[PDB]
Every structure is written in C-alpha cells, then in structure tokens.
A paper describes a structure:
The 5′-end capping of nascent pre-mRNA represents the initial step in RNA processing, with evidence demonstrating that guanosine addition and 2′-O-ribose methylation occur in tandem with early steps of transcription by RNA polymerase II, especially at the pausing stage. [name] possesses a 5′-triphosphatase domain (TPase) that removes the γ-phosphate of 5′-triphosphate, and an RNA guanylyltransferase domain (GTase) that adds the GMP to the 5′-diphosphate, forming the 5′-GpppN structure. Specific Cap-specific mRNA (nucleoside-2-O-)-methyltransferase 1 (CMTR1) and 2 (CMTR2) methylate 2′-O of +1 and +2 ribonucleotides, respectively, producing the m7GpppNm (Cap1) and m7GpppNmNm (Cap2) structures. Here, we determine the cryo-EM structures of the paused elongation complex in complex with [name], as well as the paused elongation complex in complex with [name] and CMTR1.
In the PEC-[name] structure, we unveil that [name] is docked adjacent to the Pol II stalk with the OB-fold inserting into the root of stalk, and positions TPase at the RNA exit tunnel. The OB fold, known for its affinity with oligonucleotide or oligosaccharide, mediates [name]-stalk interaction and stretches its OB loop (residue 476-484 aa) into the gap between RPB1 and the stalk. TPase domain of [name] is surrounded by the OB fold, KOW2-3 of [name] and the Pol II stalk, with its catalytic pocket facing towards the RNA exit tunnel. However, in our PEC-[name] structure, the association of [name] disrupts the original binding interface between KOWx-KOW4 and Pol II. The typical position of KOWx-KOW4 in PEC is occupied by the TPase domain and part of the OB fold, leading to diminished visibility of KOWx-KOW4 density. In our cryo-EM structure, RNA protrudes from the RNA exit channel and reaches the TPase of [name]. Docking with the crystal structure of mouse RNA triphosphatase into TPase density, we observed that the 5′ -triphosphate points toward the P loop of TPase. The DNA–RNA hybrid adopts a post-translocation conformation as that in EC, instead of the tilted conformation described in PEC. Cryo-EM 3D classification of PEC-[name] showed two different conformations of the NELF complex in the [name]-containing particles. The C-terminal region of NELF-D detaches from RPB1 funnel and trigger loop, leaving the funnel partially open and convenient for NTP delivery to the active site, and trigger loop swings away from funnel helices, recovering its mobility under this conformation.
Author numbering:
A (entry chain A): 626 to 673
B (entry chain V): 6 to 555
C (entry chain E): 2 to 210
D (entry chain A): 914 to 1154
E (entry chain A): 1299 to 1394
F (entry chain W): 57 to 588
Amino acid sequence: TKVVVENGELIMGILCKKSLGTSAGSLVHISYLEMGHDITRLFYSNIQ
Amino acid sequence: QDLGVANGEDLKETLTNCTEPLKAIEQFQTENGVLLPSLQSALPFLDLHGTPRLEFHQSVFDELRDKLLERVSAIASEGKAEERYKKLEDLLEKSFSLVKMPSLQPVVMCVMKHLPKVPEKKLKLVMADKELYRACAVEVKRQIWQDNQALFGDEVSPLLKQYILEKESALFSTELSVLHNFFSPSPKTRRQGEVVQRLTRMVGKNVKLYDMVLQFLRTLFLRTRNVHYCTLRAELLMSLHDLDVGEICTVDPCHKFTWCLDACIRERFVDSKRARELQGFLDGVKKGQEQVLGDLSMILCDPFAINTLALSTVRHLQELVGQETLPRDSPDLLLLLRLLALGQGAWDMIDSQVFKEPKMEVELITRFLPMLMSFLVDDYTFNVDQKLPAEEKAPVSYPNTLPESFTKFLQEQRMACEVGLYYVLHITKQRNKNALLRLLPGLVETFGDLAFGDIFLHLLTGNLALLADEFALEDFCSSLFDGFFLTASPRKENVHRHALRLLIHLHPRVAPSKLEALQKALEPTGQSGEAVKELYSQLGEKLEQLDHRK
Amino acid sequence: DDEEETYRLWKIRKTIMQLCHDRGYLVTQDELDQTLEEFKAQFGDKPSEGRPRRTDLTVLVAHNDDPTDQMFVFFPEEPKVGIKTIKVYCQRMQEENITRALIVVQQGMTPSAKQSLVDMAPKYILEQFLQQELLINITEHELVPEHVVMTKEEVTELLARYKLRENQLPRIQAGDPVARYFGIKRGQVVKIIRPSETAGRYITYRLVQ
Amino acid sequence: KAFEKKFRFDYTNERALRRTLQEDLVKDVLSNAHIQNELEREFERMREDREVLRVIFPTGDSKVVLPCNLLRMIWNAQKIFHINPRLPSDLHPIKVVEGVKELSKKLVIVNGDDPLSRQAQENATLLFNIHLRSTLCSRRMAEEFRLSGEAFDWLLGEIESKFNQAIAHPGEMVGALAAQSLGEPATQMTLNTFHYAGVSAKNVTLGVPRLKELINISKKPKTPSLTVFLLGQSARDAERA
Amino acid sequence: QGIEQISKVYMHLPQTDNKKKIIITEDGEFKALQEWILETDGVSLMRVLSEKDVDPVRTTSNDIVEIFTVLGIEAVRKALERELYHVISFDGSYVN
Amino acid sequence: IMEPSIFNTLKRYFQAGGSPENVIQLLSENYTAVAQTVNLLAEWLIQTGVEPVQVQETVENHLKSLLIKHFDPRKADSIFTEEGETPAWLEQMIAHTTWRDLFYKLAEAHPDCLMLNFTVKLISDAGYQGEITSVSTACQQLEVFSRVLRTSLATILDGGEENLEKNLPEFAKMVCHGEHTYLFAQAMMSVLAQEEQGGSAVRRIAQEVQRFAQEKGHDASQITLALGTAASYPRACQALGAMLSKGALNPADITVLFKMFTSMDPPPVELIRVPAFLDLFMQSLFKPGARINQDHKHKYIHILAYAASVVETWKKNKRVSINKDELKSTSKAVETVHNLCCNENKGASELVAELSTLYQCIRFPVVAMGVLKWVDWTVSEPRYFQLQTDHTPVHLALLDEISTCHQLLHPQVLQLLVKLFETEHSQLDVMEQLELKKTLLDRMVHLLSRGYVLPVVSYIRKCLEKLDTDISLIRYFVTEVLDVIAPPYTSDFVQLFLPILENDSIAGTIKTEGEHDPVTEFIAHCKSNFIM
C-alpha cells in the first residue's frame, strides 16, 4: 500500500485515486511537470 | 615570623643561605606543614606526580580561601544577629594578624565588612596603613569616616569638585539644541551620575556622614556661591530616596518637599495641587525649627527648581492674560513667586542665619508683572493684525520702545530680573524676533548681571538657534551681538565663550560682512583663557571648510 | 464609577501616546507605556469631580525633527462638543504659533462644529476622535498591517520607477480609521508592509483620496 | 536544538567529515577558516530566515505553495547521476553556498538596480529563497542528500529553468481566470443544509448564503458574529470566562 | 449588562489550531494552548475591544462592513481574504 | 616554606657547581609564608565558621585527587612500581582505599598496570572479596574472579529472596561484563546445581543471571543450552537454540518440537522448563493482539501443558514412572483462557460472563501466570481506564484471584500493582485518579492479607519517605489494614508497621470508628510486645 515510482519504474504500491487521480502531487501531475505535456497525453492514452 | 609563625624572615634566609642540613629542612616542613596525619600517606602520590609541589597546594589554598569567604558571607546572612556578630568577631580576632598577608587579606576584609562595629584598635591599625585602608570595603570606611571628619572631607572634596566641573562643562556643550539642553535630562537620569552614585554609596545608611556631607555642601555654597551644590543636595537626598534608605529619609525635614519638587521638575510645570502641597510643606515649619527654612531655600535655589518655577510663572501669566485676570488675584502665581523668592534668598538666609521668608516687593506684583502681560498683549494684537485681510490692514508697526520702568525693575529687583529673563527665553523659543529685539536692550544692565549667567546664556543661545534664518539680516545680528554680547564679552570670558559657540553653530547663516566683523571683534587677546582660544580656532576651521564648499 | 473612569482615561492617554509616537513625535519612553498605578499617582485617582479631571492632561508633544510644529491634545469636559467650546481651543492655539491639534470628544460632535472644523483647515488643522476610537490602538490588531507614511521624495521615486501616476495607485479613504490615526491628508502615498503566505512579504501603496 | 543539529554543518568533527566528504575536501574544510566563517554566516542567515518564517507563519504549519519542487529535483538528480549515497560525496560545501547565492541572484521577479526594485525583488522571492537555503544547505547536501558536483550544477540549472517557467505571463487574463476559479467551486458547494451541529457553533451561515454575502457587500448579513479572544488568566479560567 | 446589538453569546474551547493560541516555547518548539474563546451572535467591535480582559489584537469579526468602520480597508482586505478562504475550504476543497 | 622541598634541593645544594642561579631561585621558589601550616589552620578558622568536620580532611583529600588527576602519573607508574618498593600504595590501600584507587583505575585504566596490580592485590587482601575492586571489570584474572564469585554467591545464598533484588545487579555486572566469565559462572552454576540438596537456589541465581544477560544484550541462550543435558538429544536442542537466538515463536519450530514430544521416547523434561522459553510462550500466546492461526494452536497448548504438568522419577539418571493424566485438564484450562483472551468481546460482555470459568481456570499456576501477563499487557495500555464499572476492578479482581490461589506470583503481582500506582494516568479526573489509587491500595491490602506483607509495607514506607506520595493514601492504607488485623503480631510486622503509624499523621487515623478501637489498640499491643 506504499506507492513508490522510481527512475520511471513502478517499484511498489497499488495505485488508487490518490496516485493517478486529480489530487495534487499525484503521478499524473508530476508526469506533467517533470516530463512535457504531449508525454502526459501519451501517458493517459496508454493507461486507458 | 609573627605569633606562632615560622620563617618569613628566615624564609628569605633559607633562600639566601644554601649549604646542607637536609634533615633540618625536612623536619622544618614536617613541623610547619599541613599538620595532618592523613596527608603524610598521600604526599608520596604527589611525589610520584612529577610536577613540583607548589601549584597543587596553591590551588587547595585558593579553594579553601574561597570556601571560607562563602562561609563568612553565609554566617553574615544566617542566624540571630548577636550569635552571627559574635562568631564574626571571634573570627576577626583570630585572623587579624594575617591582614598584611595578601592571600588571606580578603578574608579579614570580608569579616570586617560584615561586622556592624569593628573594634577601634583594628580600625586605627587599618587607618595607619594606606594599602589596608584602600583595600577596605565602603562599610568599614564608613565606621572610619564617622569619627574622622577630616579624612571623610578629603575623600569627598574631589567628588564635589568633579560634580561642579561636570555641571559647568554641560553648560558649555558644543551642540546648541533646544531639545537637548542643560535641563533636558530627567531627575532620575541625573541621579545616575557617577559623583551622585559614589556619594550615595559612601554615605549609605549613616546619618552622621549624611549630615557631614550636608555641612560640606552648605560651606561650599557659602564660600563659592555655586548653586550646583544646592543641585547636588537635592540629587543626593532623592538618590537615597530611590534606594529606600529610611534611616535618612525619615529624619531629613526636606524629604517630602524635595520629592514633590522633583515631581514638579520632572513634569516641568507646577500645577495648583502640587503648589498647594509645597505651600503646606512650607507652612508646616514649626516655631523653633526655622533652620529648616534655610535648608528648603537651598533646595529651591537648585537651578532646575528655579527653571521649573519661572517657566510655570510665565505660563501662569499667559493664562491670566487669557482669563482677563490680574496677577494679584491669582493665589497660585503668588505662591510660585514666594517659592522663587525663597530660592533666590537662600544664600542670604544661610549666611545671615536669619531664617525668615523674604518679603516680596509690592511693586513686583502690582507693576512689573502686568507690564509683562502688556508685552504679551502687544504680541497677541500684532499677530492678529498681521492676519487681517489686506483691505483692513492699517500700517501697524510693532511697538519697539522699552519702558524705562521695566529696565529699572530688571536692574534693581532680582525677582523681576529673573522673571523677565525667563520671559525673554520664552519669547525667543516662540521665534518672536520683534519682542526679542524690543527686550534685548534691557538685558545689558541687569541685577547682578543675571543676564550674563551661564545658565541663561546657554538657554538663550539654544533658543536663538531657532532664529537661524534671521541671522542673514545685518540689523538683527548688529542688535544681538553688538548691543548685547559684545557689550560684556571684553569684561566676561563666559559671555565671550557663549558668543563664540553661537557663531560656530550659526556661521553658515550669518551675513558674510557681519561674519567677518564678528570674527575680528571676537579675536582672543593675550589675556584670554584657553577655552576661548580653542573655540576661536574651531570657528576658523569651520570658516575654512565653508569657503572650500563654494 | 470612578475606577472605571481613571482606567478609561489612562487607556486614552496610552493610545494617544502611541498615536503620537507612530505619527513621528517626541514621546518620552516612560510616558509611552506607563502603569495604571503610575497614572493614578501622577493625576489623582478620582476623575469624578477630582484631581485627574479633564484639561489637566492636555498632552503637548513636539516633532522628532523640526521641533516647532505641535499638536497639543485636547480633552473637553462636556460630552457633546460645540462651536463655542472649540473656539476656546482655537483661542489657545492662536495664542500659540502651532496649527495642528487633536480633540478627544466623549459623545458625538454637533455637525455644525464638524463643518466648523473643516472651516479652518488651511489656517490650522483640527482632528477629532471619539472615546471608543482611542480605547484600542488599532495598529496593534493582527488584521492591521504596517502602515508607513511616505515622504514626497519617496513618492516621486515610486512613480518614476513604476512609470505610473497618482491616479493609478490603489487608493484609501481620508476617513479611514488608520488614515485618521496617522492623520494623513489627501494625496499622500502610504506604503503598507504585510506578510503574504505566497511570497513572504508584500509592500503595497495607497494614495489618499 | 533540532534546528542546530540538522542545519549547522558542524565542521569540528573529524570522522563525520571523513564519512561525508572526500579527504581532500575534508582537509580543505578543516585547514581554512574562511570557509568555516562562510558556513557560520550561512547558518546565521538560516537563523534569520527561521525568525522571519515564525513571524510570517504564527500557526505551526509549513504546507506552502512554491514553484520548484526542490526535494523532488534533488531526488531526480540523485537518480540521474547514480549517486550511491553510501560513499563520501565529492562536492565542496563552499561550492554549494556560492551556487545558492548565485542562483538567488539569478531568480529575478523585479528588474532594476535602485533600492526600491531591490526590495521588491527581495520580497517577491523571500519565501522561495528561504526554502532554497533550507533545502540546499551545506549540512543536508553533505549528510542526507550527497549530490555530486555535476549533479549540483544540473540541479542549479534545473531550478533556475523551472523558476523562469513559472513566471506569470504578461497578457494573461488574470481577472476572468480568478473569477472562474472562484465560481467553479461555487456550484459544488451546498446551499444551506449545514449539519447545524449544535455545539454552540452559532449556526454559522456557510455555503452560497455566505459566498453571496461576501460577494455583494451586505450590511444585513444573515448571521453576524465576533470571535472574542480572552486576554490572560480569564482565557484559562471558566469562571472568569 | 453587556452591550446592545447583541444576543446570547456562546463560549467554547477550540479544536482546530486556527483558533487555538499557538505559542513558541523557549526551546523554539510550537505549542497549541487551548484557551477559552467567545463567539457572539450580534456584532459590535470598538466596544467589545474596549472591554477589560479581552484580547484587543486577535479579536476578529464575521461582518465586513463593521470592520471597515473599525479597522479600515486593508484590515478589511485581510478579513475578506480569511472569510472567503473559510467559506471555500470549509468542505475540504482548495482554491489557490 | 621552600623547606617543604628538602630532598631535591639537597642534591642541588651539595653538588650545585657551575652557575647555581636557577638552583638558588628554585631554592627561593616558595615566596609565600608557611602556607602549608596555614592550610591546616584553615580548619582552625573553620572551627569558628560552620564546619571543618572530618569532611574537611575529606575535602582536602578531594582537592588532592583533583589536582592529582592532572598528572596521575601512569607515565612512570610502571617504572616506580617495578622499583619493587613503595609503601605509598600499600599504605593508601590500607587506610584510604575507599574510592581513591577506585577513581584512579576508573579514569584511564590502560596505563599504571603495576599500580593497578598493587591496588587489585590489596583489594584481594581486603576481607569481603570484591567491594573495593576499583572497577566492576574485576573478572580478568582468574584467582581473583573465582574467589570474588565464591564470596558473592555466599552473600546472596545467605541473603534470601529479599536480597535477591538488592544484590543481583551488583553480582551480575561482574559475571556479565565478560561472556567468558559468564561461561565460567554458568559452569559453576551447573556443577553446583547437580545436587538436589539445595541446588534450586543456585539454579534460580543462574536463571536470574541469564535474564540479566538477555537484558544487557547477550545471546546467552546458546550457552544455557550447552550447559544443560538437552544437548544430549541434538536436534531438539538445536531447534531451541535457533528459536531462543531469535527470541520469537516459529510454528515450524514448535511442530518440529511437537513431533519429538508426545511419543514413546520423550526428551528429559528439563529441556522445556527453561523460564525464558515459557516467557516467550506467554508473549506469543497471551498478548491481547498477536493472533495465532488456529491450526498449530493445540500444539502450543499441549507443549505448555507438558512443560507445566508432567512429573518424573530420575532413579540414577533414568526415568521409569511418568504420567500425563493431568495435562488434559491443563490443556483445557489454557485453551479456555486463550479463547477468552482471543474473543476480546468489547467491554467484557463475555469476559464478565465467563468469569466463573476463568476463576476455575486460574486454579492452575501456568494459567494464573498467563492471565497475570495478559492483564499486565491489557491494563497497562495508555488511555485504558475509560470503561468504568467500579473504576474498573474486574481485571483487578482477577489480580485478587491470582494472589489468592497462589503465592509464588506475589512478587510479579506487587510489581504490576506498583507499576500501575507509579504511573500517572492522564486525561482522567483528579478525583477519579485518586479513587483508582484507592482501588490499587485495596488490591495491595488484599496482597497483605494473604501473607505477602513485608514488601508491600516496605514499598508503602518507601513511597511515604522517598518521593513522598499523598499522606491521605497512606492514611487510607493504615485504616484498611487495621480494620482487618489485631491480636498476635509477629515481631517483624510490628517493627515494620510502627514508624509509619507513630510518625507523620497520628491524628488522621481515628475519626468515627468507635465500635472497634483505632490504632490505640495497636499502640498498646506494641507496648506489650517490645521492651520499651
């Protein structure tokens, strides 16, 4: 129950809405800020 | 090699002699060492140490001495008074032979410090030795001083001279400031001076020493005519008050009066309630205790008290003008004048030993004061006329004539002169140049040259700093300097110093022609004092700097 | 009550001292914060027809520099002040040469006297304060940030640096209680330092209108 | 004491420096006293920043919004540059201090050189510079982060770049943006179905009936209140309360 | 007793640290002192602020016009900010 | 006063030669008066002060050691002692051996090996073998350590259960300083415990030493199993060694043990009687949490029952008659108790209901010990006292039952009671806390009723004198004790109960008793007993 994504690879943890949802500091928010914005579009599409 | 003491002298011998008897030396240490069997077994460890056997014993001795000092303090603090005093007396009897030993001298000095009465023989022995006397605490020195008035006077006189010098130097400060003048410090701040604190510590709770100091102050006030001795009397009494010294404050008849006057000085004004309290103190002097009146007059002779009372008198005169009332009908004004009269007559009362209130002259109240009110009245009407619309502006010239009776009052009556001088200071502080020019010719000749006193000149130069822009006018500078300052500067060095200070402060605003004329007129002569020459040199340096700024 | 009256007078005195100090005047340090017992000792502990009555504690203070201008504060005896009462204070001021002054009214001023106060503004300035305004120094409140009056040179520097006019600054009322506390006139930029949770410190400016 | 233990970078200890730094840097720090003076000065600045923060935040919370996520950037530098933080680091703490100062010089909200603009720049990036000093200090970089020199240079570049990207763009329609940012949560808010938990609580009118009273300045609010805080002993006594 | 323009006043001990008195101990650590606070039903500042044993610094209000009459415009800006943040973040939502 | 340096001045006096300027100056270096004598006269001056008591000589020697500690010359200590001389150390150890050499060898202890040797030999020369040992590390040289161990064992064995708490740390800091010394001591314990004529106390002391070893950080369970006969059957002892090296219960390990038990060839029962093993059993079984997975649970219960049930007859190192006819009842009782501790039905809706069955169970000693540990781990949870029936006396009623049905658990019961009494309970009303203390004192009175009195009264006196508790609590204790006891009075009870009653609040004991007389009766009986 402890989500750790490390060096672009999911080490451990189960991703609930607190990991992929609209909460601040989530995986998608950091993917938007650290990576680009086209990359986040690809991220959403691949997940779905 | 005193009582039961081995070699101090043969110790010097032991350091000089140097041949051979080892067993004699060892036996001497055994007999005159730390005579404890328990230490004999512990010494070989010190021998097994390597460091020479001096630092260890010195450290132990110092620790024992400090513990003994702590215990002497504890004995002085704890227990019944008789038992602790007896223990301290026994300890002093056992230890006084070592008073000349530097390592044990602090213990003896502490024991003497905590004793209410040191035996007279030991006190005489201490007095005969300059170093022992110097090392003694003030508590022992009080027991010495109370029965030796000459020695106490020798100790106190430098402080009194220093106090007088400090006051005079404060009167001649380089900075001319209305906000920061001689009367700016609060009484509590003034009592923090080094001389006052040192005198308070020396007197302590001893009434006899306090009376000796009061006698010294009276004698010096009579001999030198310096009012700062009165200032010092007031400050010393109130400094003892601030330390809750009831042994002195309860027996001094001037304590409550001086306290109320100190409050008045702090507020720089005397209200009706405080005036009535001071009057109740004065009227409470019983028949047979009339010398208290001389003491109270000495308190009122304090320049701070005089300044407060005179400023209150001027303010009351202005209020009476506002209220359409005569000076004779105001009891508070009459009371202020009575206090001022006592303060001014202090010297005569003490010198003649005739302790009676000076009679206030009728013509003061009935003539001189309402004429001052007329001067205020002229000022008000001129100010109101200047604000009229231009269509109603008659050519109103300010009244420039000084009545001859006013000048006669300033010349012949001390109280009228004092009140007029403070009125001049008041109008100068208000930047009323017309009234100042009107009254200035009457200050050339005043009662006892009071207009040339250092207090008045200090305040006057400070207030004249507010009229700096008027020094660009040659008529104003001619009036001020030529008609007032230069009339007395050749005969009075202090007037020369005050004029030089004013010129140093205001040279950038003085007209250049008048500036050159004043520089020539204020040139020190061969008989001029060192301070005048120093001030003139400072003025020259400032003038050179100003020329370089062109 | 009599103890309540001396407490109220002491609080008004303390607030007036703090107001004068924050305005930039000569306020003695012990006078700036004195004990209530010290006030009672200095004045009399009986405002009810007694020693610490009004007009006894009219505080006269000068400026820290240029010590000429003074605003010696006024405390009327009556609750409801009028023109014939403020003309006595005008007489006392015209007796002097100083133009600023503060009166501390107990109840509301008569509106005719309110107009009269404006009727001498170019000649000599008079401000008025109710008792409830001076029972709390509002600048000590946590909601009130640090207001500092700016000099004209600093106003010129501000307008030249930001290349904007006095018409464009966010403004402040002349009847603003803080503006009344500092007694600022119209057209006098006030810098305001307040802590911000997003930048640490924020300095805004309020031209007076 | 926790602040001093965590941020001071005690230099007098030998073995701690041996573990945290390489021996050449260890002897460089231990030999020179000018570097020790600079480290003491940066700890002085951090004590000053602590006092400034405690003035700014009287309530004991530190969850504050700032542009550059510095801890995440330090972690990213560690993951990119393959730190292996068991080994002693090889970045000079004086390099850390000077780089932080140069970076604080490089982060510009307000241009100009006159002291008014200098004060504006200081106030605009006061909180962020406090956070930058706190996160990128010498002690933490030597003990709990252990970045390398090239990693530190990349970190400074990344911080500068990501701060320069967060500047408000001239021409942004801020007013409509804020109006929508406030009116969009308005729909998600209740009208008036507050639980009215009767624990005193005065039935504070909350939701839209309160947002409206704030939006149009109502001189007749549904529920006007005070919050009267007691001063001294009366605050800790129910009877005086 | 009391002032006009006010109905029954309710007093309580706070739970959230926004109302709890946050002090700084001599070792620098924050501490939340839970002291009694009052909470009225009317509104009158500059008269409650004048009362004895009332903290004249932290005593805020709920009405804005009353503060504008009492504490000015910038204090009203701060009070409007705090009240707006209160009404927004009551239900756990966040607005920048 | 340069006389005090006759010796070194000597060889520089007869043989000075050359330029004796430094010789004359060092002959002249004592520029003060006879301050050696003046330092002794400081005691005479203190005679007029407060006190230059023998403590004055003690303080002089303390300053001696204070300035000695600078040099404390290890430097030439070996040389000066290899000189084969020096009654200095001998005389100091004869007279001042209290703490001087103690601090000396506590300071550095690496150098001065011969000063240390002389001090240690003089410590050996002292009667009570090891009390001035300048170090608790006196376990290095065997001839000293064996005799010190012998005398300490004699002291403890002559002491008893009361001295078991006072002397055991002072005995275990030596035998646990070194684990080779621990092995030596445990081997001696084993050899002395070979005898059944009083070796039980030796085994108890060995077990306490092993418990202290476990506390301090030893993995001493392997040594304990090596000393025992359990190693004769290898695999079970190896399993125990691993399990006790980990200090936790493994179901696989217990299945390995259980496969070897309950067969026709059981191991000697002394392999399972080790108390740390049973303590780990209690930890893993009767914690309020720590659920056991219902499958090897009966194996746990059977192992505990076999540990605490069976008897044997070692007729010349062989058993011929054992029985297992009561471990079924023991297993049933322990199973019921574990079920009661596992159901944890909220506020004992069931704990109160099955209390009669619990009373039936606690007739057994292992059951009583397990319930005591479970109540210790339940009541001592912070913020527990929020259920209140009569300030929650239910678990304290179980405490009373445990104290009633047995006597060897009384030290643990009193330890739990005083641990709860010393524990300040936050978030409770002050009157509520006071009544909780009253309930605990009622439990202590019940302990006092069943014979276990002297430690309880000793703790009451300790908490009245040292870190003094409320006087009203001691008054209530006296009131409740004297409402139930009266006539005969063994002398020890009177000797311990007199000072707390006669000093410090005589008056509060008697208010409204009347029908049965107050402490006056106890005072009269105390007068009649002793010799005034």
